[PDB]
Write a protein that binds this DNA or RNA. Structure first.
Length: 267
RNA sequence: CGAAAGUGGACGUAUACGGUGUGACGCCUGCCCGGUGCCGGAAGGUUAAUUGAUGGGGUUAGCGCAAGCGAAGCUCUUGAU
């Protein structure tokens, strides 16, 4: 580690390792804006993209974009949302409203928080890229002006602009190299989500893995049929790609709309 | 997955999702890119459909006791580029 607060580390008692818990978000039990959630990985018939199972779920939760504007929010409390490790905060506006948001770093205890063109440049709320300096640290932008997609994976996930780019397009995703995006779009400007939140190890399958997805491991396993490689006395020799996918890099995504992003190296 | 619509991936979005191999942990993981595969380049050589230059043949108004020559059109071929 290197920050506050460090992450507990279970001690050797019954094959135990790193866990995950916060400083606190005082309460253990949510609000109400949520759905029911689907269930499995299967596609109206066949499995599709194997792997996917295990119980424990529910809890949908929401909010993105942030259509609402210049109306002062107040962070009600940080909160833990399933599947996605990016916390969530709560927030109440000065008119009893209550969206959710992706809990930035410095947040908790109330705080400023304002959206709309021309708003405090801290980590409050979304803001049209235009009305933003260099944004060495913006947030979950949107490929389009209205949406809120992009990097909702907040957890340590950032994005760097380029001070003042014209033509109305910029941004620099993580490994996404360079890529221009409509400047009439807005970014939370905060850009955080706590990294250590993703700095512990599940532990030992079962009570750490199974509680999410099935054995995502098949390896050769042999049996020249179940996979494009098998049999043999006890070893591999040859190619090992499933459905001649060709795991030798290859790359994909060709022609069509988009593909008008830039730079992108190859190491 | 599906002729498609659509659906899963995910109401997730690179600290995410997939595929491959190894299989806690400890100390480590050396030399070879010739072969095959993959990744980048793509200047030059070779090269598909496509357009179809140019020539060659058929037929025949006409020129002719005969020998043959044959335009224009239509055709069969040829294939530059």
């Amino acid at each position: 580690v290197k920050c506050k607060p460090t992450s507990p580390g279970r001690r050797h008692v019954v094959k135990v390792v790193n866990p995950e818990l916060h400083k606190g978000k005082p309460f253990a039990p949510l609000l109400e804006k949520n759905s029911k959630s689907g269930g499995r990985n299967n596609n109206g018939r066949i499995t599709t993209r194997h792997i996917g199972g295990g119980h424990k779920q529910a809890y949908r939760i929401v909010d993105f974009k942030r259509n609402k504007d210049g109306i002062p929010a107040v962070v009600e409390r940080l909160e833990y949302d399933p599947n996605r490790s990016a916390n969530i905060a709560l927030v109440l506006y000065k008119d009893g409203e209550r969206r959710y948001i992706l809990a930035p770093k410095g947040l908790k205890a109330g705080d400023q928080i304002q959206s709309g063109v021309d708003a405090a440049i801290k980590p409050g709320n979304t803001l049209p890229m235009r009305n933003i300096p260099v944004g060495s640290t913006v947030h979950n932008v949107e490929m389009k002006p209205g949406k809120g997609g992009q990097l909702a994976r907040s957890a340590g996930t950032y994005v760097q602009i380029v001070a003042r780019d014209g033509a109305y397009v910029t941004l620099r995703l993580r490994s996404g190299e360079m890529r221009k995006v409509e400047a009439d779009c807005r970014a939370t400007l905060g850009e955080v989500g706590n990294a250590e939140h993703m700095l512990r190890v599940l532990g030992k399958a079962g009570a750490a893995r199974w509680r999410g997805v099935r054995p995502t491991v098949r390896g050769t396993a042999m049996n020249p049929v179940d996979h494009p490689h098998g049999g043999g006395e006890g070893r591999n020799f040859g190619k090992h790609p499933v459905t001649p996918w060709g795991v030798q890099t290859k790359g994909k995504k060709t022609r069509s709309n988009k593909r008008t992003d830039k730079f992108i190296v190859r190491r």
